[PDB]
Amino acid sequence: KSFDDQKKETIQIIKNHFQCEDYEAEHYLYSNAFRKTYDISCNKKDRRIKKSDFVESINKSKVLFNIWFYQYEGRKEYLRKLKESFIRRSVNTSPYARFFILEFQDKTDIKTVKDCIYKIQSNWSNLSKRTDRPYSPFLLFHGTSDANLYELKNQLFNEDLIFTDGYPFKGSVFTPKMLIEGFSNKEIHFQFINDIDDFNETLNSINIRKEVYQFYTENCLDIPSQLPQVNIQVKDFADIKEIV
Amino acid sequence: NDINAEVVSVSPNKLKISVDDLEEFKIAEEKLGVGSYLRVSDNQDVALLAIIDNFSIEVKESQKQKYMIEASPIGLVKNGKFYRGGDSLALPPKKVEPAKLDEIISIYSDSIDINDRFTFSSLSLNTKVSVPVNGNRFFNKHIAIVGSTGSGKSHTVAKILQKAVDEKQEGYKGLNNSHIIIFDIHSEYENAFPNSNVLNVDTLTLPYWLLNGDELEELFLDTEANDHNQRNVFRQAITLNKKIHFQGDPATKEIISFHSPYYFDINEVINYINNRNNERKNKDNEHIWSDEEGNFKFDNENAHRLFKENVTPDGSSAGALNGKLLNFVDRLQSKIFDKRLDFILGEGSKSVTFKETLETLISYGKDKSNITILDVSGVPFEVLSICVSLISRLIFEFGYHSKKIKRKSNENQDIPILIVYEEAHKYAPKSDLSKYRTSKEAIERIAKEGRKYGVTLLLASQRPSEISETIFSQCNTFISMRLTNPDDQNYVKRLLPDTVGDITNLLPSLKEGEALIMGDSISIPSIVKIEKCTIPPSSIDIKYLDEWRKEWVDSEFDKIIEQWSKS
Amino acid sequence: NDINAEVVSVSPNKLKISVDDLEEFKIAEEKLGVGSYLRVSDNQDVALLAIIDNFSIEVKESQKQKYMIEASPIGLVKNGKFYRGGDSLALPPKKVEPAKLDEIISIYSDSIDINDRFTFSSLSLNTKVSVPVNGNRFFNKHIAIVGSTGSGKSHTVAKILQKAVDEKQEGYKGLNNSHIIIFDIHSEYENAFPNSNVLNVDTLTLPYWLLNGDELEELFLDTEA
Amino acid sequence: GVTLLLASQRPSEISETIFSQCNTFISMRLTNPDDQNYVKRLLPDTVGDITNLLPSLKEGEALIMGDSISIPSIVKIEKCTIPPSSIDIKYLDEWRKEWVDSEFDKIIEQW
Amino acid sequence: NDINAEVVSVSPNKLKISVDDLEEFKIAEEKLGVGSYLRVSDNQDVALLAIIDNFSIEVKESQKQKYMIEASPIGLVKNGKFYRGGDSLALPPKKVEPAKLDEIISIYSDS
């Protein structure tokens, strides 16, 4: 019944409320519920509590950051709790159209973003010469200027990491077919989706199962709701690498 | 990239991995060995861990080099936790790299919790990976430590007992509850454990009356001269003598049988059988004898007075056993008067009792020690199986009376005993010869029923091929040093527990110190490197080329001859 | 689709199944393993049943993946009923998909009447499929339960008797007509049956006069003298 | 109407005239090759690699075979919610204790 | 180069030596027989030592002579000192020479 002892008792309360599974009760639902509890207590103006809008606000299809949950067990414990929950992997990863929407801000260095791309591409692709169904992850970045976005694009291309954005030449219109044909191309490491408008055009061109792994810090993109999504909020961009 | 390997074929219990690019060239030397581990996955999260079995690096003049590693899946790692199981599928192609350090540690550390880990060795191909065994299951189940001579098998045995002796929990500075009995025939562990109780023939005193019916017959009966009269009189001479010397509670005096462990005077037993050689009889077929008290018949009420030599028989005709036991009497005096059997048939066995004998065997006397080394080098070989079976049955029955007292008392103050049988094929041979049958069934009793009474065994042998399969299979945990004889290798391979594909083919190729443990106590059958002994077992071997190179020894010949004649 | 497998070779007691697409990777992990059961048919009502004995997934740079499965027919499913006998012929090609849960259950339960099933275990390779024995024929014929140390031999014995006491006609509460006598030498089944009558030497009163002539001469008489 | 269940840790020491009167056989792991040769010879049916699987049967894995079960199959016995009193001694747990002095003379006096 | 031999295949405990020239025509008689010792190295300092187990000299009418030597490694020599337990991986191809008099002595002398 203490701060470090009671907290397990809320899980079965959330579990029978939504008739939900165990892994999204403790990690997705209760962690979001505790965060909005702080937001009505951290402010010193309105400490009164409502219930009608509180129940549906936490089911926003996002795993918001919890600063106390990050604190009393450390960085390594908190990032692996997100590793087994929404990044459930297998030895036989299927060729699905995986989308990685990452919030790239102007305060983020290029090298830290390149380390995350090099881990996403290595873990979510199988570009073997022997496979008949190769796959490559789709990479989308937002929240950055175009000039800073092209610097990451150019440095990635120098270290032999071949990608397509649907723009095979200068002055080209967006060609979604090059993104799909690079998914089955073993010499194309990943796909660099340029922006939101090019992102939403890409989903209409694929017929196979699609997954979305959004990792952000402040703002989140309103992805269409029918496909599976993973929305995880972190502190910095370096936390994303140890989650993918 | 350092290595570019890939699964190109999948079998139900085999993987075929082709290394396409090899650039660093130390991955092949260190991380692509036969006993090495590989992770098979498209990601770093969940990997199918596999051990290598074979490889064939073919090169050609114009063709590309093909490496073709053949491996077998041993289990499944997931989020740092390793699940065993060979029935896990990795659909080819899958990226293959050598297993990282944290995954190899997760093979062994995760299966056994902290309070149950017993570490005495580290992995041979990765010295940073400690290999703990389930220390409860390591010793509660029986151990077989084999490996050819010169491979350091006795190094492996003593290192295990040294770690078990130093297995002290925090709270005390005294000795722990380790109880190790070593049947040391090569006299190696005297210098391995200096704080122990080493017992040679000049120090050990084993009572002859603690032998059961099988061991008493084996010491004194002639198998070729299998006389029913010699067999049966030996029971009546001993069982009646055990009744007389009993002076405690009279309720168990008449319950004494031949196998009951009470004291009898064997000098009186010889005098009884020698008197039965002097058997006379009358018209009524009744043997009449004369002593200082007077004339008496031969019945159970006068059977006790033939135990002294001052008996003069009275009669006319030939008795039932007149002269048929003189083969027995002269064989009995060749044993009790044998100076090499002074430790089992001398005057020391007359005065010692049951309690001091058992205090000597598990070092529970005045000088308590965790390890009791029984130096059986001086024991004659024709009585060596008897002496082993006497101690083996006494310790096992001590463990029986330990448990069933505590079964009806519900106390956790327990005495678990390990018996190290070095050169175990001597004691429990494959052959069904009758001379070693006493020690074969005593070890088999400990091998089968012994783990429930807290008496478990450790079979150490450089040549396992004469160890009987009824006893060697009871050793759930099996440790193998370098084994160079194919007869020993094929005996091991067919007696083996549930292993992995080609780990037992490394037995002839083991270097110095490398071992191989399987069984329920370890997570994975693996080639480890045993921790080097800071106090190794060294036997005092007489150095012939050192002594033969010396000048002709002239003084030390008459000292040998005059000591032979007791002068 | 998720599985595209078909028979490319028929022996008298061996099938050779070639997997062509295998789009869903989840099927291959648990349903295409060795010992798993495949159904072999061109229709959805009459099918062969084949247990996988071996497989070999061959992959190469230029050609497609060669996933080849060795299976052996065990029986026949006609309209949900399983009939044993692997002598039925299925001329190739016959499309192959993994057997359903009710089909594998029908392998081990359709030879037994529903009133006559006594279940104490499930299949080792598929824990969702129970393996009943014929109930009546289990106990009136003698049973030998043998195993090594720590293998659960005492657990297997205790579980079987536990289902025997739990074997009840659905008409009553209380004790059923099960009668089990255990000769416990190692004192292990007192815990496993807490509602039983454990009889050690403190409470047992065996009358000595019910012994015959031979047993009275071992309780009282020494045979050596 | 009086039948028997032969539960033995060591099947090779039961009488052949008694062990063969059984019809249903439940064979768990058997490490002793004397046990395996006795069981395989007296067994009513056979399974494909019974020589190699009898050592290799895991915990709780048996082989139900005989008159009551038509297909001799490898099963997993249902987990005991009330398990029997297991016989084992956690040696390292006992050996880590300090030297037991009191419970030694009790064993000698009752012998 | 009187002898030009080369490893073409490497097993855990077996090597395939391909003699390419064999100009001397006496090296094969004494130093490439079964039981002779070979020098598997690409440098003069550190060398694998392998004993010849079996050879085969196939000769055809038009093609080249394929002298194939099957040898098994026994140990390692590092600047004149022999270390037993030969399992160090010699990545093919490698120059193969008969072991000189000093290495073969070092197999038996220094131990």
Numbering used by the authors:
A (entry chain J): 151 to 394
B (entry chain B): 5 to 571
C (entry chain E): 5 to 229
D (entry chain E): 458 to 568
E (entry chain D): 5 to 115
Provide the publication's sentences verbatim.
Here, we biochemically and structurally characterize a two-component defense system DUF4297–HerA, demonstrating that DUF4297–HerA confers resistance against phage infection by cooperatively cleaving dsDNA and hydrolyzing ATP. HerA, widely distributed in archaea and bacteria, encodes a DNA motor protein, which can hydrolyze ATP and translocate along DNA. The enzymatic activities and anti-phage defense function of the DUF4297–HerA system are activated through supramolecular assembly.
To reveal the assembly mode of this complex, we further determined the cryo-EM structure of DUF4297–HerA complex at an overall resolution of 2.87 Å with C2 symmetry imposed. The high quality of the cryo-EM density map allowed us to build the CTD of DUF4297, whereas only a partial part of the N-terminal DUF4297 domain was modeled due to the weak density of this region. The cryo-EM structure reveals that twelve DUF4297 molecules and six HerA molecules form a giant assembly with a molecular weight of ~1 MDa. The HerA forming a planar hexameric ring resembles the head, while twelve DUF4297 molecules, organized into the upper and the lower layers, resemble the hat. HerA forms a planar hexameric structure with a central pore in the DUF4297–HerA complex, which is significantly different from the nonplanar conformation of HerA alone. The base of the hexamer, supposed to be the DNA entry site, is closed by the insertion subdomain. The HAS domains and two layers of DUF4297 adopt a nearly C6 symmetric conformation with a continuous channel. Six DUF4297 molecules from the upper layer are held together primarily through mixed salt-bridge and hydrogen-bond interactions mediated by the adjacent CTD domains. Six DUF4297 molecules from the lower layer do not contact each other but form a tail-to-tail dimer with one neighboring DUF4297 from the upper layer through a loop connecting helices α3 and α4. The loops connecting helix α1 and β-strand β1, and helix α2 and β-strand β2 of CTD of the lower layer DUF4297 form extensive polar interactions with the HAS domain from HerA.
